[PDB]
Design a protein around this ligand. Sequence first.
Ligand code: NAG
Ligand code: NAG
Lengths: 679, 680
Amino acid sequence: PPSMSITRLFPALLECFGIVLCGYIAGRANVITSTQAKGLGNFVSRFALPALLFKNMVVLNFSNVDWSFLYSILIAKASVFFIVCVLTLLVASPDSRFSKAGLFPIFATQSNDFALGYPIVEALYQTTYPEYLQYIYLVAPISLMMLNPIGFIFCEIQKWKDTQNASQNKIKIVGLGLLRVLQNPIVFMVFIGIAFNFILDRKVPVYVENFLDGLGNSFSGSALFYLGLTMVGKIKRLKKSAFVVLILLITAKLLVLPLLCREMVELLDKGDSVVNHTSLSNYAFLYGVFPVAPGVAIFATQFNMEVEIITSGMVISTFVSAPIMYVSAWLLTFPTMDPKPLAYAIQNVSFDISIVSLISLIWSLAILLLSKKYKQLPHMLTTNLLIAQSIVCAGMMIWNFVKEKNFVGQILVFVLLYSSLYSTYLWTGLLAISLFLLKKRERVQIPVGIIIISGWGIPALLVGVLLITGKHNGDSIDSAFFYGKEQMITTAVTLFCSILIAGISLMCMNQTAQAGSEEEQYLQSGDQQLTRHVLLCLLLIIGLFANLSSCLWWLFNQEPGRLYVELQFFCAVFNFGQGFISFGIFGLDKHLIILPVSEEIKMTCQQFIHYHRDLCIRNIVKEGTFCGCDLVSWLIEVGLASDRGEAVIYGDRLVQGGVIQHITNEYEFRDEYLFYRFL
Amino acid sequence: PPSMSITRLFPALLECFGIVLCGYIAGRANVITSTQAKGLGNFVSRFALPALLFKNMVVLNFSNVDWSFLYSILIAKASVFFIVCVLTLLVASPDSRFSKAGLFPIFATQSNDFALGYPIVEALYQTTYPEYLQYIYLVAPISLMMLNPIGFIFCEIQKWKDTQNASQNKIKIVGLGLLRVLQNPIVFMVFIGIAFNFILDRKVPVYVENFLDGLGNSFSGSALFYLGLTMVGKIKRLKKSAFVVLILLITAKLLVLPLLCREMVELLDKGDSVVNHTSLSNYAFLYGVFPVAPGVAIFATQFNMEVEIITSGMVISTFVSAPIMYVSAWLLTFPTMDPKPLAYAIQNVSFDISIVSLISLIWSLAILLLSKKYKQLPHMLTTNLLIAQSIVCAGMMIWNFVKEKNFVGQILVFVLLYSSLYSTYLWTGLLAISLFLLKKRERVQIPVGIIIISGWGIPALLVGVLLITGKHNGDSIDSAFFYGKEQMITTAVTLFCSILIAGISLMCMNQTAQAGSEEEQYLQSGDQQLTRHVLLCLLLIIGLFANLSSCLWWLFNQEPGRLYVELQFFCAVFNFGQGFISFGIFGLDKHLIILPVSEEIKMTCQQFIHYHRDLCIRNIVKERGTFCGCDLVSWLIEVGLASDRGEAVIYGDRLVQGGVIQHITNEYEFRDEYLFYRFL
Ligand SMILES: *[C@@H]1O[C@H](CO)[C@@H](O)[C@H](O)[C@H]1NC(C)=O
Ligand SMILES: *[C@@H]1O[C@H](CO)[C@@H](O)[C@H](O)[C@H]1NC(C)=O
């Protein structure tokens, strides 16, 4: 029988994470400020989500539910909750372990079922298994009801113990926990919808069906866009211990929980069919990979506990769940697929990732170009790493079309593709050593020519050597085997060399960092960008090792097993999605990316002039000038602006109304520690 | 052949105007402030609407378009634009006629096609005529492109002439007009989508299809909810001339334009099939009834011209387009329907309006009850008018089920229904005379007992007389004919009496008004509520005359024509939707309806204490440490701590919940209602 419908997953992930990208880009551009974002959030959470829940709860046929799936996912979440909660209580400091042990387990267990899970489960299972869609709306509310009051109880215990009203007792603590759970619109409208599922005989009474549909159908896009908006400023830099804790919590949500879900289904589902049993446990895994709900960050801010870790982790979890979902769904379809269609399938994964990663790379190239940063170091070498990744993705798009044709011209496509791929590897090496040479004392100036020459020519020369030494096999569907064992050796050699160069050079960069224990802010900006390049080199090093280990496993075991095609698929993912990694690291400095009278502005200027002007000057101005960031901080502290977004837009109005200007008037209003004057 | 699918229209109008009601209620409760509302608006207009447009433009098969429909609707809009523009240029004052002649024609022509038009056209035509859905996405952008730059040119001329940079010329004026049109995301993304319709061979390339679907599918609900949010404070009281101008512009949009659309289709569509020609001109009318786009109000605020008239008119137009759409769609289906199914159809119209109007009346009753206003006058009599309307709607729900059964018990159902209906008529009379007796000098105190006694007993007595004088006919499907000519006479008598009592008493109330040429603000609130009751009596008087004229037309012409079943359908509409009218007039005083420390609040209090406290006191506080709540709201707005009265009340609510302030007796929470507060 045919599979779960896996070719529909990438379009659905583009829906999900591209609408989240739209929300992020809109908030980052201050098209929608955080105050404005709360309107979309209130629409979502108070109207669209409860209507979606109510409709799907009234329609739901409770006689047909596979309660074993609910029990298994629920017990998987309950056991992850037990693990994370008991661990946190044992490990965390007594000043905060109750807040942490409340919110960290909710983090580890509460999935983004509605906004992200449902479109993905729809796209995967709507045609093949339309009953699996019901279990989104079942598992998520029942999970809130069972598991969230335990975590809320621990947070209320933090409040009780910190406020020291020690005469109070279990009734108030447990009651406040349960009351938060009952008040939550998810739980609230699921009880209401279950009640009406029985009051009506599952028929939405026609009159309100269109109303409920209109609200619910809007939830999907609006919740994804609101998720993007809430992600805008959230990746704050954390303590090293908080980064380790984040990795543990994100691993709980995205790796431990789906594994436990799959195992629990294979324990509790004692139904007959092996194919439907496998599809159910595959769905259990997919369900486990969903990211953390933004609702957990709402809980954290409502308790004002662990807000930084939970918000940052919800954001990072959302980003990380996309590649893990794609990887995992394909991996689960593979052990139900034949080897030639499996080759074509990996080449469609490669083609998908390479097309949208190429568009990500074209954007990142426009960044490095129009910022003029491509003239500075390391950014010149980064531009070459991005051009290498772009030609990798282009070569993958060319290969997917050419692999069955132009039998000699496959050599040109292979030269393009694998010379550029070896170039991305070797540029990982050369960019890492550029970071070492930049962190070392600046008199050790980088030999730019030699390094760019090597970054392209050594890959070109290596592929020429491969053309000399290897034997053609265009009948191999994957580019990765076009010259067989010689290609695998040359690739392993390239990667082992690059991993050595990069590991050694990052260790030496680290040692020069240990030894360290407008133009000035632009140089400091270059150093901070170098630190982002350290992050890039670390992530790319992980990917390099993924590819090296795959090559080594094939070379060691030239009769490859199922784990080898897991590794070949993950190799494709890194090889072609490293462009997404770049795009996620260089999509940051909005002003460097983009930049290089109305009655509303009149009112802004009059509000300032007639009232706050002298007070502001008395607070900020020194020998008629002030930093833009300090006016932003003042507008926030004084409450004229709700956030840094409104603060920059109020500064933009005050500049466009001439209450202020930049000192040389060469720049518009910015948060970037530029300097401004009153007129 | 079967009709356009008219039973799907009421559920679609509930989608549309109930999600608009959700947005309105959410904004009125300050669940979403106006600043917060701009986020939903920017999502809609900058992402969801352009994605919807792009997808539907790429999919659109341009070989199959009935260009004659586009041309006809476009020429109908262009002629309405010409009429309204030339008229406004001739009639309006020279200080403003260029701004008015820009924006009033855009008002008269630009429909709310996407948010409200498309769900309705979907529900009506999706199964029967799925090609008619394309023409939403064609007519609306092409209408913007052709007609909006003319109006924008007139507004830019207002700017040029008021700023007096007289050395400038046509190039800048016309260029700014065209540039506003081109920048508009509708026009922008339709040009982009048409280009991609040809670049791709109409195939959305699978990868972005789900992305575009996710954004576009969300447009519907989010745009309706945003329309509700933008409607919250907008019905500002206008000059009498502005009210007349509003009626003319709303009539242009909702009555002149659909008639011209229908006529233009019947001129330009020279295709073969009569059934498909009739469905096309019916669609042209339906398309014309769509309300004014909120985009026109965005244009008005961006020019800062005619903002009050246009915003208020967009709001009122949205409200008025709902009953006119329902009425019109059913009326257009009637001349393609058989008489017994036409009777069942009007009973289903009556059942629809009566159910949701009954829920509106249950809400309005909860208003009058929990505000305790039902003890005060005129509100006691208004509670009786609402109970009469509730028992009317309940009787209609009972009649729709009973009319084929319980052949003797139909008498009990008829007694309930038509005694309560006669009671709503007679209560229009008695409420109007209560307004006269309240506007007259207060020593002329109302005889409450006699008036409530009459308001229920005279209808009960009249229906008893009908039971005596009439002949039963349960085989008549409509309640309105259950006792035939005697029922029509008794109804006409009831209405003629009520219209006389109400017209005379409203004229006498008007004469006492001409002669006029915390407890104090609560009494003034009672008088303002009486003025809202004047509005109710006026609207109900229109409905009374609708029913009286229908009864008279049948009694005069006892072989009724097609126009008589138009009038019987409109009678049903008023008889059972007067509850919506009440619900739209009594859903106003939120605090009277509903009412009778966090780090965020700490931060609010600290922002005030550490900075604005002394400045505020120096501005507002007097020896009445005290200040009105409305004045702190006005100050928070003028000082920019709050963006609007919504944020201002929520900041006052935080400052109260944080104890920076309290009410003078602490008996009340923070309000805009000229209550009085103190610092601590
Ligand atoms: C598997 O699921 C399909 C689709 O829901 C259903 O038709 C079929 O009966 C199921 N088979 C088994 C063995 O459960
Ligand atoms: C009406 O339109 C439909 C759909 O295009 C077409 O199939 C049918 O032939 C038309 N009928 C007439 C009578 O024109």
